Amino acid sequence: TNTLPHVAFYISVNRAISDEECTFNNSWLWKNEKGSRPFCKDANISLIYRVNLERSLQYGIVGSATPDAKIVRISLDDDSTGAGIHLNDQLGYRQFGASYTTLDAYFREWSTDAIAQDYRFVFNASNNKAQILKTFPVDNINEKFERKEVSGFELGVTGGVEVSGDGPKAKLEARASYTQSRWLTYNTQDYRIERNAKNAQAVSFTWNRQQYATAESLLNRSTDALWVNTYPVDVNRISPLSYASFVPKMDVIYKASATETGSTDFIIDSSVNIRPIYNGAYKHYYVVGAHQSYHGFEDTPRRRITKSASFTVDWDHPVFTGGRPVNLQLASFNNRCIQVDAQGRLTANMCDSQQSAQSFIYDQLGRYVSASNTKLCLDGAALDALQPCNQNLTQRWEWRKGTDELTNVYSGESLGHDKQTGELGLYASSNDAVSLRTITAYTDVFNAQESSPILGYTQGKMNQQRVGQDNRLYVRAGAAIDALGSASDLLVGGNGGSLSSVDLSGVKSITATSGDFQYGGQQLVALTFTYQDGRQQTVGSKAYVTNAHEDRFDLPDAAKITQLKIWADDWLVKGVQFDLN
Amino acid sequence: TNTLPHVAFYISVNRAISDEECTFNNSWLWKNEKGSRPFCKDANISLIYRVNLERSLQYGIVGSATPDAKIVRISLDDDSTGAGIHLNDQLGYRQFGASYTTLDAYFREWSTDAIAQDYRFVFNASNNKAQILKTFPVDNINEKFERKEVSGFELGVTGGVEVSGDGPKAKLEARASYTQSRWLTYNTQDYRIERNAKNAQAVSFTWNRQQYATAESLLNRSTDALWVNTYPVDVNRISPLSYASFVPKMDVIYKASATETGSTDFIIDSSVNIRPIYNGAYKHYYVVGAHQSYHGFEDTPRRRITKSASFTVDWDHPVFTGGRPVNLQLASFNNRCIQVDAQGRLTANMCDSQQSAQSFIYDQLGRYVSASNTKLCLDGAALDALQPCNQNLTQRWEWRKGTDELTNVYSGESLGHDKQTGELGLYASSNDAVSLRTITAYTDVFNAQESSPILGYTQGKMNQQRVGQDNRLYVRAGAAIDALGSASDLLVGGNGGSLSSVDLSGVKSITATSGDFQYGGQQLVALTFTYQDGRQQTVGSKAYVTNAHEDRFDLPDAAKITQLKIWADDWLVKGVQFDLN
Amino acid sequence: TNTLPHVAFYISVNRAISDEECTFNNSWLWKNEKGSRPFCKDANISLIYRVNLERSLQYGIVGSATPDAKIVRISLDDDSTGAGIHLNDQLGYRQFGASYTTLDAYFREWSTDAIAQDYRFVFNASNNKAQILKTFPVDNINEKFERKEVSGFELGVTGGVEVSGDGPKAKLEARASYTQSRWLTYNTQDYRIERNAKNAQAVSFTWNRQQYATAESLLNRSTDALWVNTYPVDVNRISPLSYASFVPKMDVIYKASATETGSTDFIIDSSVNIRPIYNGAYKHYYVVGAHQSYHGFEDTPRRRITKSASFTVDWDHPVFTGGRPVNLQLASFNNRCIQVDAQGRLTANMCDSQQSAQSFIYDQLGRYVSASNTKLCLDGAALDALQPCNQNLTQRWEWRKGTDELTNVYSGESLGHDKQTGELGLYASSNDAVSLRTITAYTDVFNAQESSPILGYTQGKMNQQRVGQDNRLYVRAGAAIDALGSASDLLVGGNGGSLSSVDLSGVKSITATSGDFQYGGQQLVALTFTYQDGRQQTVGSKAYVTNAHEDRFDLPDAAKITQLKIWADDWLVKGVQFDLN
């Protein structure tokens, strides 16, 4: 309670990966002939980010070497990571041959169970109120190299003596060599952490395969006699980090200005790039003889499975004052505290320790500054409302040691309240209608509001709309969701759908279906609303999509949907987020 | 007593391994001809895990950078590991030859005493109330590699002079070489710790052989003349870590939400993968000559012996308040404390320092919050029962310095109790019927309930059932245990056997028999109940099972079995835990 | 006096090794022809273990992250090791030749003074009340390896010009090489520390030769012309660690449950595996020429000399309360303290600061808890005996600041005692018969009882028996000791002896003789009792044993033998320990 306060919370990022999603052709050489299979067993993403919100300084601290700012920290580190990312328990392979006859072409293929070509994590601020301040790792590696430069020479002589029937021979010989080599030594990793600094609002970290990144590099045989039929891949070079378990560690820190206002959304795209491995053998025919040579095919298919989450930051949140607020409780009542409305008017309400509107920062001057609006202070000149903060002595308060009386610095009079109405005033002493007893305690204004699931994909331009007075969601749906909006003229997305309307009041849960759209790309194809009464309602179709995923959102008891966040291009909607309260 | 409280206990995991369990064919080449033996002497598993339960914060702490959460820690570390895992004191071998005559085939074999192909530890949460937060090791190794790239050239000249009878000769010669090599350097271990992140509830660590993982790799001879008969294995490459002693170290940490409720089971599967080693020699016949070449057989048999344990966490347990509770003792009596029932009604009972229902957390406001139910507080407005916690001044209490009187912040009156009934009230002063003397002390609500043994295996789905006051265990059983349950109509498991029934009153011991089932796989096959009266009773058959193991549960004097946990698939029962709770 | 208490003592392990014990054949090739000698000078074992006993927590500490447990620590470390193990001051050799004529066989041999093939330390709990919690070293080394993979090529051309009488010649030549190598790098030690985790009660550490473990590996010559006669061993590879001085360092830590009771014995077997070294030369005869080739013989004899010690832990010992006890001294008397008997009855005895029965732990409640029996407390409701501990206010005491008066929390009255009888009571004030003066001081209940020596060998199953009312040791002896016991029907051991009986009262010393039994294995062959009066008595024979050792036990003045510890198989006794008081 003397230290800097934080808002702190975890964001669980869980995403099971379907067998379909994990499925590819058994063959590259003979794509269509040899069929297909799942290339991973029970692939899954389970991460836990930790978020911190704080001011860069404690309230009222002056002349620090640390610039005043609003800070947002997102991290996976030693203290919190989650289970990790999994594709397989072990790696197997299947073999295939050409159905036809072969003189000089590819004749065998091995497709190996899939591994992660990369794991990737993308961080995005929704607007420019926030900029990236620093990250960990801080940057890409500036690699060091070791060069060797060698050179030398050799001088030799050889004396010879041959004796034979033909006669005696004798040789004296002399040599001189000059040698010169160049060495270069350097390091690589299984996975290299590649940082991408797109701009002030966006950065991404990709753990990308480096050593052994290609199918080619997994080969431990180059050539063979054609009677040889065996797996030419050293599966040992494929590390458990590539399929069994991967855990990222990174820190991203955004900053907003000391006076920033409004809100920003922060979006985290966690993903694995699933990559099956294809190698082939090639029958060589040259007249004299024939052999078999092994190869890796690199331009084979890959699939990126992504799970996204987002959280919202209100730059006006009490935590960004860097102060630790308290309340002022009118103690003639069992349960009444000073509370301030939007215009600053003061009333006496039942105390609620999480109500920012009952919270004040007691600053170095002895002012009681509203934690919800730091422009306003308790001013004894005018106790009907908070007044703009200034140097008025009437805005400064001191507690009478050993009592419950709060005195005003200017007049020395005490803060009193009406025993029945709780109306505030300054008094020299108590009387039958007024109590001088004020009680104060620290309040818990730092609790974090939970975040709605993103349903679908965070692709395309993102839009945001307040939910209308009529309390309805507007929809153009057909084979997929064409567009959404808060009113019929404010539709974000495409044009193609039949226009519909869904009632947002009484929704107990929403279930989105999305995936690879038959007609093109990745889209949000269906929403299903379930109400408190039990009735359901659906828009769009579950039938024009493969690699489908289902996102479910169970609304907390009696919460109302108030904001829409919609990801869409010009044709179709790609995802949506229904914000509460 | 100013610090965060923990629940802390050890879980002993002991499992003797039978000679049968340790037994394999003396030969791979000639499986059936050459017989079989135990491949290890007195193999055993003896580990000791340490468990900690705690809240992430202390009670009532606000604005910490640490997210509020419920924490479960499981570890084997520097401070506690247990004896370890043992297979043998030393490694020997036996030799075998083909009984038939041999021109071109395998003719000799050496089977070497078994080693641990891997040691493995699996952690599972029974439901999704808990997720993995972090582990140690945190992940698989992202291996670094050192590449060297070298290239050079050599320039040479040689001057020659030969003199012979035939005549004088002379040579001037010139050379030019160009060389180029590539180096790759990297590390391996005897055992590599492989992490498997199955999903948010499950993770596993496997110490897996890496260098020298194959029978092939143990070979220190490649070829020989056929008159050579000797062990082609360098037994030195087999480390004591592979048979004599192995001790894992790892940490697994689960988290539940700050408001999570109910219970979760945590299941730990410790295991060693016993692997005998087979190598063979091959007589080669080519017309010109003949030699012997050595080989390793890798697809030979292995057997995994497993010992499981589990513990239960009630998320409602006082430890997860992060508070240190005290009691309120009505001091006119020698031994009477305020106690709260399930509805919050207050009575005066004999003090029990381990009774959560007599424990309160005295918080920063001066409220006495029930440690068993933190939604309720001592409220002077209504001292017949605890009231929902709020900001009432009547819920705040201050001790009168240097006395035993507890005062109520609102009225200033003192907490008094009736000298005969212990009924609570607020009083300005004592009188002949009411005492104002209240005493308080910290209480020990952090003791850990001990956990029932898993009898059998923890495969399949796990069901939970209470045992009625009829204390009867219902049982369908054939050649194995088909199903179990606390009622005839509530059996869990398959449909197979003859219905039966067991008295659970006065059981001194329960002795499970499990193993490799004759009809197939691994199953629980028998249960022997032994009563204090001396009698025995059995269900299932000890006669349809190979590789048998007996799990024994010795019960406290006059304990009552209160719950059953049953692991079983659709066909049979795999295991059962008898909670004495 | 605010910290955790320990019991702490050293255990001296000294064992002189006899010339006989150190003696082997001068030759392996010609065992019987060439005689025998001592292969070490003044070999000796002198170690000092340090033992610590403690609770894992201090008394009454609650909610620690450390599990409550009883701890036993055995260690040889930086702070205590003893002199060490010694076999020789330097290493010499003797040479030997075949007495016969030799064309193609071994003809020379060198036997080198002996070295320690290994040093070994075995720790054993006598029962399962104690389990191994952790050790140092914690485990066997998981060795790291460095692999290099290299490959390259060379391209060359050579221009030639020869001029001779015969004519001018000229050559243009072209080359292409391809190279490929594999490197493996790793570490070894002179001695490797090999850990053997037999089970939860037993672990052992063996310092085992690794590099240079074989006679073969000591050879610095492979072949020679037969005129060469010299030592083919590089004696430099044999380290002083192998004969001159060896000092082990290890830590073994056992744990028992927080409520464990009774006793456990801890047995430490320190040993050196004495190994003479034999190498031989082999005359080779092939028609054309002849040479000499050198060899190491590995299956030569070794002898393990062992010295065992044991100590006993009573889990009921005050140290395991984790508290620091004090006494309550009735101060009207010059020397009288409250003392408690087995049933809890209180009497007033002459104070003895080492008497656990006069010791109390003054706990956080203000209870005086008996240190000898923590179930009982001083209770003012009934001062004739300690009462079962509970929350009674009458079990809580507070000292009146600045006086010698102890008051009872419940009534406020003071603890008084009768000036003549020391009978306790509660009083409002003193009077002519009762004193209120009580004095208290910390007591020394942590002294360690010394341990009796082990006679013979700690081999076979260990048995324990209370000595009978008749006070006699029963014996079946013949060529060796066949069996021992506390009564004629309670004989532990074999059958073969003539049954005898020895009086155990008035024994001043016992002298065991043991060694390599002529008929088989290692046995206890003779016991000799010497009495206070001077008379002697013997059982068994000193005449059927070689490599005999004599263990002597001089009993402290007027101590009575009360327990027997007997190591024996089914045939014969291997060792015995006579426990005192």
Coordinates of C-alpha atoms in Angstrom, one line a residue, chain B residues 131-343:
Chain B
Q131 CA -4.6 -25.6 -16.2
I132 CA -0.8 -26.0 -16.5
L133 CA 0.8 -22.6 -15.8
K134 CA 4.5 -23.5 -16.0
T135 CA 6.9 -26.4 -15.7
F136 CA 10.5 -27.2 -15.0
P137 CA 12.3 -28.0 -17.2
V138 CA 10.3 -25.3 -19.0
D139 CA 10.7 -26.9 -22.4
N140 CA 12.6 -29.1 -24.8
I141 CA 16.1 -27.9 -25.6
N142 CA 16.5 -25.5 -28.6
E143 CA 19.9 -27.0 -29.6
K144 CA 22.7 -24.7 -30.8
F145 CA 25.0 -25.9 -33.6
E146 CA 28.4 -24.9 -34.7
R147 CA 29.1 -24.8 -38.4
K148 CA 32.5 -24.6 -39.9
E149 CA 33.1 -23.7 -43.6
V150 CA 36.6 -24.3 -44.8
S151 CA 38.3 -24.0 -48.2
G152 CA 41.9 -23.8 -49.5
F153 CA 44.4 -24.6 -52.1
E154 CA 47.9 -26.0 -52.6
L155 CA 50.5 -25.2 -55.2
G156 CA 53.5 -27.6 -55.7
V157 CA 56.5 -28.3 -57.9
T158 CA 58.8 -31.3 -57.8
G159 CA 62.3 -31.5 -59.3
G160 CA 63.7 -34.9 -60.1
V161 CA 67.0 -36.4 -61.2
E162 CA 67.5 -40.1 -61.9
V163 CA 70.9 -41.6 -62.9
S164 CA 71.1 -45.3 -64.1
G165 CA 73.0 -47.6 -66.4
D166 CA 70.3 -47.0 -69.0
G167 CA 71.0 -43.2 -68.9
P168 CA 70.2 -39.9 -67.0
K169 CA 66.5 -38.9 -66.7
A170 CA 65.1 -35.7 -65.3
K171 CA 61.5 -34.5 -64.3
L172 CA 60.0 -31.1 -63.5
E173 CA 56.4 -31.5 -62.2
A174 CA 53.7 -29.1 -61.1
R175 CA 50.5 -29.5 -58.9
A176 CA 47.4 -27.6 -57.9
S177 CA 44.8 -28.7 -55.4
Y178 CA 41.6 -27.1 -54.2
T179 CA 40.0 -28.3 -51.0
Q180 CA 36.7 -27.6 -49.3
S181 CA 35.1 -29.1 -46.2
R182 CA 32.0 -28.5 -44.0
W183 CA 31.9 -29.1 -40.2
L184 CA 28.9 -29.5 -38.0
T185 CA 29.3 -29.8 -34.2
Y186 CA 26.5 -30.4 -31.7
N187 CA 25.7 -32.0 -28.4
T188 CA 23.8 -35.1 -27.2
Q189 CA 23.1 -36.7 -23.8
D190 CA 23.0 -40.1 -22.4
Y191 CA 19.3 -39.3 -21.6
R192 CA 17.5 -36.4 -23.2
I193 CA 14.6 -34.9 -21.3
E194 CA 11.6 -34.9 -23.7
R195 CA 8.6 -32.8 -22.8
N196 CA 5.2 -33.6 -24.1
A197 CA 2.5 -31.0 -23.7
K198 CA -0.7 -32.9 -24.5
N199 CA -3.1 -30.1 -23.5
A200 CA -3.9 -27.6 -20.8
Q201 CA -4.4 -30.4 -18.2
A202 CA -1.6 -32.8 -19.1
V203 CA 2.1 -32.8 -19.5
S204 CA 4.8 -35.4 -19.4
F205 CA 8.5 -35.7 -19.0
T206 CA 10.4 -38.6 -20.5
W207 CA 14.1 -39.1 -19.9
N208 CA 14.8 -40.9 -23.2
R209 CA 18.0 -42.6 -24.3
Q210 CA 19.7 -40.5 -27.0
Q211 CA 23.4 -41.3 -27.5
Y212 CA 23.6 -45.1 -27.4
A213 CA 19.8 -45.5 -27.7
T214 CA 20.0 -48.6 -30.0
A215 CA 21.4 -52.1 -29.6
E216 CA 23.4 -51.2 -32.7
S217 CA 25.1 -48.3 -31.0
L218 CA 26.5 -50.5 -28.2
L219 CA 28.5 -52.5 -30.7
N220 CA 32.3 -52.0 -30.6
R221 CA 33.1 -54.6 -33.3
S222 CA 31.7 -54.6 -36.9
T223 CA 33.3 -57.7 -38.5
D224 CA 35.5 -60.7 -37.7
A225 CA 36.9 -64.0 -38.9
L226 CA 34.5 -66.8 -38.0
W227 CA 36.9 -68.3 -35.5
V228 CA 36.3 -65.3 -33.3
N229 CA 33.7 -65.8 -30.6
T230 CA 33.4 -62.8 -28.2
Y231 CA 30.9 -60.2 -26.9
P232 CA 30.7 -57.5 -29.5
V233 CA 29.3 -55.0 -27.1
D234 CA 31.2 -52.3 -25.2
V235 CA 29.3 -52.6 -21.9
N236 CA 31.1 -49.5 -20.8
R237 CA 28.8 -47.3 -22.9
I238 CA 25.9 -48.4 -20.7
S239 CA 25.8 -45.9 -17.8
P240 CA 24.8 -46.7 -14.2
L241 CA 22.2 -44.0 -14.9
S242 CA 20.6 -46.7 -17.1
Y243 CA 20.1 -49.4 -14.5
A244 CA 21.6 -48.8 -11.1
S245 CA 20.0 -45.5 -10.1
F246 CA 17.9 -42.8 -11.7
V247 CA 16.4 -39.8 -10.1
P248 CA 14.2 -37.3 -12.0
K249 CA 13.8 -33.7 -11.2
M250 CA 10.9 -31.7 -12.4
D251 CA 8.3 -29.1 -11.3
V252 CA 4.7 -28.9 -12.5
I253 CA 2.5 -26.0 -11.6
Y254 CA -1.3 -25.9 -12.2
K255 CA -3.5 -22.9 -11.7
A256 CA -7.2 -22.5 -11.1
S257 CA -9.3 -19.3 -11.2
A258 CA -9.6 -17.0 -8.2
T259 CA -13.2 -18.1 -7.9
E260 CA -13.0 -21.8 -8.8
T261 CA -15.0 -24.2 -6.8
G262 CA -15.4 -27.9 -6.3
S263 CA -12.5 -30.3 -6.7
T264 CA -9.9 -31.6 -9.1
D265 CA -7.8 -34.7 -8.9
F266 CA -4.2 -34.7 -9.9
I267 CA -2.7 -37.9 -11.2
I268 CA 1.0 -38.8 -11.4
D269 CA 2.1 -41.8 -13.5
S270 CA 5.7 -42.7 -12.8
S271 CA 7.2 -45.4 -15.0
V272 CA 10.3 -47.2 -16.3
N273 CA 10.4 -48.7 -19.8
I274 CA 12.4 -51.9 -19.3
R275 CA 14.4 -52.9 -22.4
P276 CA 16.5 -56.0 -22.9
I277 CA 19.3 -55.8 -25.4
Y278 CA 19.7 -58.2 -28.3
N279 CA 22.7 -58.3 -30.7
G280 CA 23.6 -61.0 -33.3
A281 CA 26.4 -62.2 -35.6
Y282 CA 25.9 -63.1 -39.2
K283 CA 27.9 -65.8 -41.1
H284 CA 28.7 -64.4 -44.6
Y285 CA 29.4 -66.8 -47.5
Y286 CA 30.8 -65.5 -50.7
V287 CA 32.7 -68.1 -52.8
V288 CA 36.2 -66.6 -52.2
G289 CA 36.2 -66.3 -48.4
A290 CA 33.9 -65.8 -45.4
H291 CA 33.5 -63.5 -42.4
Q292 CA 31.2 -62.6 -39.5
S293 CA 29.4 -59.3 -39.2
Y294 CA 27.7 -57.9 -36.0
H295 CA 24.3 -56.3 -35.6
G296 CA 21.8 -54.8 -33.3
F297 CA 18.1 -55.8 -33.2
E298 CA 16.0 -52.8 -32.4
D299 CA 12.3 -54.0 -32.7
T300 CA 12.8 -56.4 -29.8
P301 CA 10.3 -56.4 -26.8
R302 CA 10.1 -53.8 -24.1
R303 CA 7.9 -53.6 -21.0
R304 CA 6.7 -50.5 -19.2
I305 CA 6.1 -50.8 -15.4
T306 CA 4.0 -48.0 -13.9
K307 CA 3.1 -46.8 -10.4
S308 CA 0.4 -44.2 -10.2
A309 CA -0.7 -41.9 -7.4
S310 CA -3.2 -39.2 -7.1
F311 CA -4.3 -36.4 -4.7
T312 CA -7.4 -34.3 -4.5
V313 CA -7.6 -30.5 -4.2
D314 CA -10.8 -28.8 -2.9
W315 CA -10.6 -25.3 -4.4
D316 CA -12.8 -24.2 -1.4
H317 CA -10.1 -25.1 1.1
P318 CA -9.1 -22.3 3.5
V319 CA -5.5 -22.3 2.2
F320 CA -6.8 -20.8 -1.0
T321 CA -8.0 -17.7 0.9
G322 CA -4.3 -16.9 1.3
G323 CA -5.2 -15.9 4.8
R324 CA -4.2 -17.0 8.3
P325 CA -7.3 -17.7 10.2
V326 CA -7.9 -17.3 14.0
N327 CA -10.8 -18.3 16.3
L328 CA -13.1 -16.4 18.6
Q329 CA -13.2 -18.0 22.0
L330 CA -15.9 -17.2 24.5
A331 CA -13.6 -16.9 27.5
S332 CA -16.2 -17.2 30.3
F333 CA -16.1 -20.9 29.3
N334 CA -13.0 -23.0 29.7
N335 CA -13.5 -24.3 26.2
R336 CA -16.0 -22.7 23.8
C337 CA -15.6 -21.0 20.4
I338 CA -17.9 -19.4 17.9
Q339 CA -18.8 -21.9 15.2
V340 CA -20.7 -21.5 12.0
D341 CA -22.9 -24.1 10.3
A342 CA -23.8 -24.5 6.6
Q343 CA -26.4 -21.9 6.7

